[PDB]
């Protein structure tokens, strides 16, 4: 064993000799160390699943809200400090209604996402030019998924750093490095919602190294027609039962 | 205005309050409880400006239900009074002044006596055997002067109250569409819903 | 950190105060930072109200800006409300509050001075107070502060009785200051003030018999030399 | 930035606190060392704190820290009735309390609270019991029953193996029957150690006294020894 | 302007005119005097044209914001007290609005609040508002049972508005009808007052002093 | 704050067990306050200070054990809360409400950890017609507690023991005046107790009726009750 | 005292077609009894197939046009060059106008273009931002000399089928952009005669799915 250490570790909002901002490079590793969360996009809807991880029969699951509505057409899933994202969501719900008021239309998923990033982009304790009023990078990553009529169904990864990518299917949290390399294998431009409802489970089964039920998984989706609904425990189960069978195929 | 009455007897306090809400040309409601309960044994009737009226009485309701809940003690009438007063006196040199007149009546559980307080939109506060705001006082104060004893049973005092309302329906130009009479005593705040024909 | 300021006070020229039955007395020495300097241009014993004076030990400047801030607080917080001047006890309170805030405030060091404030208010009579950098303040029959602090404080216990006439306390506070003196010892290097009888001579006007003039009198270069000969 | 976990420690060390849902009723329970002989008995028995006419709240932690919460809440409880004319819902009162402990970390950089709290009661009109728990982080959770505090783990273990959802303590009386047993495990004398409050549908909150608490302990340890 | 709303067995009826005038001149008769706030609540424009459209549109937002934050529908009582409070905040800055907020909720039943510029908030069963308010009240007051066939009580609104459009110069145009059930509101058309008058004179035998 | 500990607090909580020594005894018909005075010089002016016993209102008073300049900052703001609750409700402020009002400012620093905690620990003695006579305590922790008899400062742990011993619930007021002095037998680093090392106070059932007189003892009145045993 | 307001008259008219919309205004700009210009246009192309006109007090309308034309530039930059729904610009204008609610833009203001369905649309505004969607509304001084006529020759009001006694209303037809243009330039030649604030020039903007076209017709200069 042995110890590697740079002299510019630690440094808060100051550049390493490379141009790296280690305070924020680390902000980004702690997504890899929270609850699992997975999003997949079809041409027939978008699916978001997470890991519940109930720690008792008492604690009635469902106070475990790791997937929440934003407007009827935009949902997001979160991995990490669920408590630290209360404010991040308030701002997104507030921005989406505010847009609906000022303009009489549902707000573009691309721009709803960018607005949330523009919020965690106010990290600091000393800014001249424009003021960024807050204290620390926002300690939570987001999968934001919804539908507008310009650019079909969409999936987005909002990072604490204030930037984002639009993945066609993404995984974040404890299993991500592995779940991600599995989605990268099993995703095609022609999935059906039924097919992806299930692939999200198969990949939660894998990177949880366990057998799963409605006490440890929550499924949700967002269709053009029905909006953004979160599957109640019954539906999540005969979706699970439906995999126990599909994989007993060969 | 807008009829706000009240008489303190031996064992309780009684508040009358016109039932009518008028918006210029039409009478909009024939059944308005013009009073908020400030706590188990303390009642406040009120009349005056349009919106200013309710919004004030509810602010006081909140602030007294909060002192009640916090010290788990039922704030005494004298105090609820002298607080409501200050809150009006504060708003009189304010930007837009609460324009509200009130009658506060309640049972002091510690002196076991009834108390009636009269406060006008200016913060003018005085304690009385009987009281009224608006013009209500002119037709009725002459009767109370005459027929009031401070040892009056709660029943003896309801009688004297009906007699005032009768005089107001006779010599007063406004159709106020009746009263609601509420009583405050040791047992709290109850409402007599059999009045315009007792 | 308050402790280090009390240390700047422990060095720096000695000063003292003695209360009597009919007056109070405060004095310090005027150490000339040079013979070229005219020592009459700097006053270590300053008037706060015509019934109250003050002396210090320590950092010169910190005393000046404290004497100024102090005079003002006597009007802003008392005279402009009640028409009277403040009583020794309370003006002292308002100075301690001033110094106590330099303590508990960020970005500023406490003052490098201990103050001796002496005065007379109609109801509390005479009184003499000490105020420390800490913002604490204590009432004294007599004391001293600064280098000669210990020698002089011991001499004052030895020589003080509660039957002193003000002239007796002037006499003492001159001896006390004669043993500690660093430079020469005359009227040009001693500053002495008293809080005694009302001085109508010094009012500046005559016509209202209800206000009778300053109790605070700062002895002249002459008055001192005169006492030091018959000493 | 780690100071959160440290505060969560003070939770541990404090007056032990519990709570238990029922078929239609709810109960809390919690407190500390009888009386140090010479202390005034009748003037701080403020174990569980009333928030509105229908909502209560106990805590494990720094007693001097709770008060700042039991107020900011007692207030938003009115400032909701006032600006929306509608008593606060038990989830909302809870989300507001927790949401405040949360904002005592991530801005300005100030210290977080030394309390976990339990919050019980019935929403307005609705007669479905509600029980929640908060912690210095900003996390709110709903529980069929729970405990937080000192030797709280012994109790959470007890309860898990004594409560079942299939049959919740229906009787008013018996719902307390259980909450007692579960604190007797961790106390340090008995009835004289920890007391209880009880809220039933529609703003009917009736806290229990000393004499009703010993028609219980001394009707428990009867059935006990019977073997 | 004439606007009216009332409670009954089958919920709430809302009816309005559509005439809008700049003095003697009739500038439009295509005015939506009933404001679709969200699919479970209605407001009635009366007083200030903009002042109503705007703050009730805004109300619709603060209402969604409230349903997302509590995962449960907002109560007419609280929907209305938000508007009442926002409006009392601007007292005598020159706001002009007199509106009935209408809703049907699990917990409250059919519920009508009258809210105006002054800061007033009033729960009631029957409210008419506008220039022709007195005319509507006349028709409503005489022919109003509580258990009215949803079809008879929808006709009552159609007609209390007619009485008013006729007399009042400042009301008229066409009638908009709405029905409010627990499941939401249902539009009931726009019936032009021109043609409707004649249809009613024949079937009712009424308006007898109108030579036609 | 490592193990669940309030460090900057224990710092000042034990800085208290250094300065001063104060006592409160609640009798059935009165209350009693008492304190020892800091290391005195011959030349310090005894009568003036009233340095560790302060009046808050005509019906409430506190004993102090802590840094003087620090408690004055508190007391100044508590004498005001009293009067604001008057001008507001035209009733005299209830003791618990005043105590809580302070305890809440103490705990204000015990958390907004950008300014330094409070020296000072209080015994409050007050009467209000809701809860008879009252005795309270206030460490900079933020906590307050009810007491039939209490003590703060140096030699605390010691007096609490003698107190526990000689106290009886039926106690009169004069009986409790003694118990207070008597048990500053022990808890005194100064061998032999004088009238000048003392400061005293009482809230009795009035010198006349059914009401409430308050009385901060003048030096002579102490040397008079000291006469009952202490020194003679 | 200082009055921060004026009138410059002119008169605008907006008509919603089936596959089109026209938005017309006169070219005369006046102060009281004098003439300021005979050509100073009132009706503007705002891009994204939206034409608007803020009529009444020029400075206030000119300034509101500027401010909206700019609201477009930024809904572009902010939402990836997206087209501004006609119905969405209307709502943004409500918020624009009501922004200055207590010191309003003294303008009756009308926009026209195509709704998301391809059908023609016209919206009218208060000076404080009440908006409704309209079939045809006129705004301005001569509003009263145009609408009655339009009601009659466009919506065939008070017109019945000959020899049906008076029971069959004359059937509503829909009109070529060329016919609407006829009625517009006769509504105006009429008004010009009996209103002293109307004349000089008539400019019409015409929105089709193909874009925005300008036709211009002369008016009596008296």
Swiss-Prot record, chain A:
CDD domains: proteasome_alpha_type_5
Location in the cell: Cytoplasm; Nucleus
Disulfide partners: none
Phosphoserine modifications at: 56
Primary localization: cytoplasm
Keywords: Cytoplasm, Nucleus, Phosphoprotein, Proteasome
InterPro entries in UniProt: Ntn_hydrolases_N, Proteasome_alpha, Proteasome_alpha-type, Proteasome_alpha_type_5, Proteasome_asu_N, Proteasome_sua/b
The family this protein is said to belong to: Belongs to the peptidase T1A family.
Described function: The proteasome degrades poly-ubiquitinated proteins in the cytoplasm and in the nucleus. It is essential for the regulated turnover of proteins and for the removal of misfolded proteins. The proteasome is a multicatalytic proteinase complex that is characterized by its ability to cleave peptides with Arg, Phe, Tyr, Leu, and Glu adjacent to the leaving group at neutral or slightly basic pH. It has an ATP-dependent proteolytic activity.
Assembly description: The 26S proteasome consists of a 20S proteasome core and two 19S regulatory subunits. The 20S proteasome core is composed of 28 subunits that are arranged in four stacked rings, resulting in a barrel-shaped structure. The two end rings are each formed by seven alpha subunits, and the two central rings are each formed by seven beta subunits. The catalytic chamber with the active sites is on the inside of the barrel.
This protein's name: Proteasome subunit alpha type-5
Organism whose genome encodes this protein: Saccharomyces cerevisiae (strain ATCC 204508 / S288c)
Curated annotation (Swiss-Prot), chain C:
Cross-link (Glycyl lysine isopeptide (Lys-Gly) (interchain with G-Cter in ubiquitin)): 89
Signal peptide: none
Pfam families: Proteasome, Proteasome_A_N
Database matches in SUPFAM superfamilies: N-terminal nucleophile aminohydrolases (Ntn hydrolases)
Gene Ontology terms: cellular component: nucleus; proteasome complex; proteasome core complex, alpha-subunit complex; proteasome storage granule
Record carries keyword Cytoplasm: yes
Main location: cytoplasm
CDD domains: proteasome_alpha_type_2 (cd03750)
Keywords: Cytoplasm, Isopeptide bond, Nucleus, Proteasome, Ubl conjugation
Alphabetized SMART domains for the sequence: Proteasome_A_N
GO annotation terms (biological process): proteasomal ubiquitin-independent protein catabolic process; proteasome-mediated ubiquitin-dependent protein catabolic process
Places the protein is found: Cytoplasm; Nucleus
Keyword hit for Nucleus: yes
InterPro entries: Ntn_hydrolases_N (IPR029055), Proteasome_alpha (IPR050115), Proteasome_alpha-type (IPR023332), Proteasome_asu_N (IPR000426), Proteasome_sua/b (IPR001353)
Coiled coil residues, start to end: none
Family: Belongs to the peptidase T1A family.
Note: Present with 7060 molecules/cell in log phase SD medium.
Function, in words: The proteasome degrades poly-ubiquitinated proteins in the cytoplasm and in the nucleus. It is essential for the regulated turnover of proteins and for the removal of misfolded proteins. The proteasome is a multicatalytic proteinase complex that is characterized by its ability to cleave peptides with Arg, Phe, Tyr, Leu, and Glu adjacent to the leaving group at neutral or slightly basic pH. It has an ATP-dependent proteolytic activity.
The protein's name in its UniProt record: Proteasome subunit alpha type-2
Organism of this sequence: Saccharomyces cerevisiae (strain ATCC 204508 / S288c)
The gene coding this protein: PRE8
From Swiss-Prot, chain F:
Position of the Glycyl lysine isopeptide (Lys-Gly) (interchain with G-Cter in ubiquitin) cross-link: 87, 186, 218
Misc remark: Present with 17100 molecules/cell in log phase SD medium.
PANTHER family: PROTEASOME SUBUNIT ALPHA/BETA
Subunit structure: The 26S proteasome consists of a 20S proteasome core and two 19S regulatory subunits. The 20S proteasome core is composed of 28 subunits that are arranged in four stacked rings, resulting in a barrel-shaped structure. The two end rings are each formed by seven alpha subunits, and the two central rings are each formed by seven beta subunits. The catalytic chamber with the active sites is on the inside of the barrel.
Pfam families the record matches: Proteasome (PF00227), Proteasome_A_N (PF10584)
Protein family according to the UniProt entry: Belongs to the peptidase T1A family.
SUPFAM superfamilies found in the cross-reference section: N-terminal nucleophile aminohydrolases (Ntn hydrolases)
Keyword Cytoplasm among UniProt keywords: yes
Naturally occurring in which organism (per UniProt): Saccharomyces cerevisiae (strain ATCC 204508 / S288c) (Baker's yeast)
GO cellular component: cytosol; nucleus; proteasome complex; proteasome core complex, alpha-subunit complex; proteasome storage granule
NCBIfam families: PRK03996.1
Name of the featured protein: Proteasome subunit alpha type-3
SMART domains: Proteasome_A_N
Subcellular location: Cytoplasm; Nucleus
Domain of life: Eukaryota
InterPro entries, sorted: Ntn_hydrolases_N, Proteasome_alpha, Proteasome_alpha-type, Proteasome_asu_N, Proteasome_bsu_CS, Proteasome_sua/b
GO biological process: proteasomal ubiquitin-independent protein catabolic process; proteasome core complex assembly; proteasome-mediated ubiquitin-dependent protein catabolic process
Swiss-Prot record, chain G:
Protein keywords: Cytoplasm, Nucleus, Proteasome
Name of protein: Proteasome subunit beta type-6
Coiled-coil ranges from the UniProt annotation: none
CDD domains per the UniProt record, alphabetical: proteasome_beta_type_1
Gene Ontology cellular component annotations, sorted alphabetically: cytosol; nucleus; proteasome complex; proteasome core complex, beta-subunit complex
Organism lineage string: Eukaryota, Fungi, Dikarya, Ascomycota, Saccharomycotina
Domain of life: Eukaryota
GO terms under biological process: proteasomal ubiquitin-independent protein catabolic process; proteasome-mediated ubiquitin-dependent protein catabolic process
Localization: Cytoplasm; Nucleus
Function, in words: Non-catalytic component of the proteasome which degrades poly-ubiquitinated proteins in the cytoplasm and in the nucleus. It is essential for the regulated turnover of proteins and for the removal of misfolded proteins. The proteasome is a multicatalytic proteinase complex that is characterized by its ability to cleave peptides with Arg, Phe, Tyr, Leu, and Glu adjacent to the leaving group at neutral or slightly basic pH. It has an ATP-dependent proteolytic activity.
Listed SUPFAM superfamilies: N-terminal nucleophile aminohydrolases (Ntn hydrolases)
Presence of keyword Secreted: no
Family membership noted in the UniProt record: Belongs to the peptidase T1B family.
Keyword Nucleus among UniProt keywords: yes
């Amino acid at each position: 064993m042995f110890l590697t250490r740079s002299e510019y570790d630690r440094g808060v909002s100051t550049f390493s000799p490379e141009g790296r901002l280690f305070q924020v490079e680390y902000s980004l590793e702690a997504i890899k160390l929270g609850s699992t969360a997975i999003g997949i996009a079809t041409k027939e809807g978008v699916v978001l699943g997470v890991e519940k991880r109930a720690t008792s029969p008492l604690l009635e699951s469902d106070s475990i809200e790791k997937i929440v509505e934003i407007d009827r057409h935009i949902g997001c899933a979160m991995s990490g400090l669920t408590a630290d994202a209360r404010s991040m969501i308030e701002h997104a719900r507030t921005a989406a209604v505010t847009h609906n008021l000022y303009y009489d239309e549902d707000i573009n998923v691309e721009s709803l996402t960018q607005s949330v990033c523009d919020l965690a982009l106010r990290f600091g304790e000393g800014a001249s030019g424009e003021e960024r009023l807050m204290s620390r990078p926002f300690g939570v990553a987001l999968l934001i998924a919804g539908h507008d009529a310009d650019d079909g169904y969409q999936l987005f990864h909002a990072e604490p750093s204030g930037t984002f990518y639009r993945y066609n299917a993404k995984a974040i949290g404890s299993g991500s490095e592995g779940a991600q390399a599995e989605l990268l294998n099993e995703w095609h431009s022609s999935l059906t919602l039924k097919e992806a409802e299930l692939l999200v489970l198969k990949i939660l089964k894998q990177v949880m190294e366990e057998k799963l039920d409605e006490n440890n998984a929550q499924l949700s989706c967002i269709t053009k027609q029905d909006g953004f609904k979160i599957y109640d425990n019954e539906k999540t189960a005969e979706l699970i039962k439906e995999l126990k069978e599909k994989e007993a195929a060969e | 205005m807008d009829i706000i009455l009240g008489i303190r007897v031996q064992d309780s306090v009684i508040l009358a309050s016109s039932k009518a809400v008028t918006r210029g040309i039409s009478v909009l409601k024939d059944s308005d409880d013009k009073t908020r309960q400030l706590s188990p044994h303390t009642l406040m009737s009120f009349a005056g400006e349009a919106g200013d009226t309710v919004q004030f009485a509810e602010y006081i309701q909140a602030n007294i239900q909060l002192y009640s809940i916090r010290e788990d003690y039922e704030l005494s009438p004298q105090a609820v009074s002298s607080f409501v007063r200050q809150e009006l006196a504060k708003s009189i040199r304010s930007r837009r002044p609460y324009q509200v007149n009130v009658l506060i009546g309640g049972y002091d559980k510690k002196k076991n006596k009834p108390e009636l307080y009269q406060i006008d939109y200016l913060g003018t506060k005085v304690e009385l055997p009987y009281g009224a705001h608006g013009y209500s006082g002119f037709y009725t104060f002459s009767l109370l002067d005459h027929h009031y004893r401070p040892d009056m049973t709660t029943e003896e005092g309801l009688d004297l109250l009906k007699l005032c309302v009768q005089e107001l329906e006779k010599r007063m130009p406004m159709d106020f569409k009746g009263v609601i009479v509420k009583i405050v005593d040791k047992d709290g705040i109850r409402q007599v819903d059999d009045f315009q024909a007792q | 950190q308050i402790d280090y300021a009390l240390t700047a006070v422990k060095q720096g020229v000695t000063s003292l105060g003695i209360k009597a039955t009919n007056g109070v007395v405060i004095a310090t020495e005027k150490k000339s930072s040079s013979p070229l300097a005219m020592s009459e241009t700097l006053s270590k014993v300053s008037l706060l109200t015509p019934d109250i004076g003050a002396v210090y030990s320590g950092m010169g400047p910190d005393y000046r800006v404290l004497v100024d801030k102090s005079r003002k607080v006597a009007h802003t917080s008392y005279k402009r409300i009640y028409g009277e001047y403040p009583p020794t006890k309370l003006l002292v309170s308002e100075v301690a509050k001033i110094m106590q805030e330099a303590t508990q405030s960020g970005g500023v060091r406490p003052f490098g001075v201990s103050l001796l404030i002496a005065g007379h208010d109609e109801f509390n009579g005479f009184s003499l107070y000490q105020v420390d950098p800490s913002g604490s303040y204590f009432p004294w029959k007599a004391t001293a502060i600064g280098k000669g602090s210990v020698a002089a404080k011991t001499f004052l216990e030895k020589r003080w009785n509660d039957e002193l006439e003000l002239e007796d306390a002037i006499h003492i506070a001159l001896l006390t200051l004669k043993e500690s003196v660093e430079g020469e010892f005359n009227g040009d290097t001693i500053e002495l003030a008293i809080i005694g009888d009302e001085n109508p001579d010094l009012l500046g006007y005559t016509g209202i018999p209800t206000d009778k003039g300053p109790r605070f009198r700062k002895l002249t270069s002459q008055e001192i030399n005169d006492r030091l000969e018959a000493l | 930035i780690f100071q959160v976990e440290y505060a969560l420690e003070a939770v541990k060390r404090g007056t032990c606190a519990v709570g238990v849902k029922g078929k239609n009723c709810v109960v809390l329970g919690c407190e500390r060392r009888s009386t140090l002989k010479l202390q005034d008995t009748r003037i701080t028995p403020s174990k569980v704190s009333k928030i509105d006419s229908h909502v209560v709240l106990s805590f494990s932690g720094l007693n001097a820290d709770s008060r700042i919460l039991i107020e900011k809440a007692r207030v938003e409880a009115q400032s909701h009735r006032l600006t929306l004319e509608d008593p606060v819902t038990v989830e909302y009162l809870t989300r507001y309390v927790a949401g405040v402990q949360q904002r005592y970390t991530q801005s300005g950089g100030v210290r977080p609270f030394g309390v976990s709290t339990l919050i019980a009661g019935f929403d307005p009109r609705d007669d479905e019991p509600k029980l929640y728990q908060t912690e210095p982080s900003g996390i709110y959770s709903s529980w069929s029953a729970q405990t937080i505090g000192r030797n709280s783990k012994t109790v959470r273990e007890f309860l898990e193996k004594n409560y079942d959802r299939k049959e919740p303590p229906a009787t008013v009386e018996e719902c307390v029957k259980l909450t007692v047993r579960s604190l007797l495990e961790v106390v340090q004398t008995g009835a004289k150690n920890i007391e209880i409050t009880v809220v039933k549908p529609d703003s009917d909150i009736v806290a229990l006294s000393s004499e009703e608490i010993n028609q219980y302990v001394t009707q428990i340890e009867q059935e006990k020894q019977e073997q | 302007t004439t606007t009216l709303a009332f409670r009954f067995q089958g919920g709430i009826i809302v009816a309005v005119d559509s005439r809008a005038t700049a003095g003697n001149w009739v500038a439009s008769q295509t005015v939506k005097r009933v404001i679709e706030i969200n699919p479970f609540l209605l407001g009635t424009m009366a007083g200030g044209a903009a002042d109503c459209q705007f703050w009730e549109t805004w109300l619709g937002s603060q209402c969604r914001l409230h349903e997302l934050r509590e995962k449960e529908r907002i109560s007419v009582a609280a929907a209305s007290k938000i508007l009442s409070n926002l409006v009392y905040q601007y007292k005598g800055a020159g706001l002009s609005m007199g509106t009935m907020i209408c809703g049907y909720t699990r917990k409250e039943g059919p519920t009508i609040y009258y809210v105006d510029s002054d800061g007033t908030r009033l729960k009631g069963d029957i409210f008419c508002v506008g220039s022709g308010q007195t005319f509507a009240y006349g028709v409503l007051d005489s022919n109003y049972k509580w258990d009215l066939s949803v079809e008879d009580a929808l006709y009552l609104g159609k007609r209390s508005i007619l009485a008013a459009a006729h007399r009042d110069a400042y009301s008229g145009g066409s009638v908009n009808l709405y029905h409010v059930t627990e499941d939401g509101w249902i539009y009931h058309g726009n019936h032009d007052v021109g043609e409707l008058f004649w249809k009613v004179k024949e079937e009712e035998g009424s308006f007898n002093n109108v030579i036609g | 704050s490592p193990e669940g500990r309030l460090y900057q607090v224990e710092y000042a909580l034990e800085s208290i067990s250094h300065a001063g020594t104060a006592i409160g005894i609640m009798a059935s018909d009165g209350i009693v306050l008492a304190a020892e005075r800091k290391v005195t010089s011959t030349l310090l002016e005894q009568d003036t200070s009233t340095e560790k016993l302060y009046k808050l209102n005509d019906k409430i008073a506190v004993a102090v054990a802590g840094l003087t300049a620090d408690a004055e900052i508190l007391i100044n703001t508590a004498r005001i809360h009293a009067q604001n609750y008057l001008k507001t409700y035209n009733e005299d402020i209830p003791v618990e409400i005043l105590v809580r009002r302070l305890s809440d400012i103490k705990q204000g620093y015990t958390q907004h950890g950008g300014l330094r905690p409070f020296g000072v620990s209080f015994i409050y003695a007050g009467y209000d017609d809701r809860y008879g006579y009252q005795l309270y305590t206030s460490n900079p922790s933020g906590n307050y507690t009810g007491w039939k008899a209490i003590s703060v400062g140096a030699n605390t742990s010691a007096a609490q023991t003698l107190l526990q011993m000689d106290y009886k619930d039926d106690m009169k007021v004069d009986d409790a005046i003694e118990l207070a002095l008597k048990t500053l037998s022990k808890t005194t680093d100064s061998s032999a107790l004088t009238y000048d090392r003392l400061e005293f106070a009482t809230i009795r059932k009035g010198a006349n009726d059914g009401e409430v007189y308050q009385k901060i003892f003048k030096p002579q009145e102490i040397k008079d009750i000291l006469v009952k045993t202490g020194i003679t | 005292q200082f009055n921060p307001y004026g009138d410059n008259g002119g008169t605008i008219l907006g008509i919603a077609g089936e596959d089109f919309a026209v938005l017309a205004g006169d070219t005369r700009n006046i102060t009281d009894y004098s003439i300021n210009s005979r050509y100073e246009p009132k009706v503007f192309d705002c891009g994204d197939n939206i034409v608007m006109s803020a009529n009444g007090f020029a400075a206030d309308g000119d300034a509101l046009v500027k401010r909206f034309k700019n609201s477009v530039k930024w809904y572009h930059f902010d939402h990836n060059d997206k087209k501004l729904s006609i119905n969405s610009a209307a709502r943004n204008i409500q918020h624009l106008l009501y922004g200055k609610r207590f010191f309003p833009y003294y303008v009756h203001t009308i926009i026209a273009g195509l709704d998301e369905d391809g059908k023609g649309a016209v919206y009218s505004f208060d000076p404080v931002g009440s908006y409704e969607r309209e079939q045809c509304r006129a705004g301005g001084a001569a509003a009263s000399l145009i609408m009655p006529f339009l009601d009659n020759q466009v919506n065939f009001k008070n017109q019945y089928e000959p020899g049906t006694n008076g029971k069959v209303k004359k059937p509503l037809k829909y009109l070529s952009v060329e016919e609407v243009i006829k009625l517009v330039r006769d509504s105006f030649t009429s008004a010009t005669e009996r209103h002293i604030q109307v004349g000089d020039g008539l400019e019409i903007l015409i929105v089709t799915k193909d874009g925005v076209r300008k036709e211009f017709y002369e008016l009596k200069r008296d």
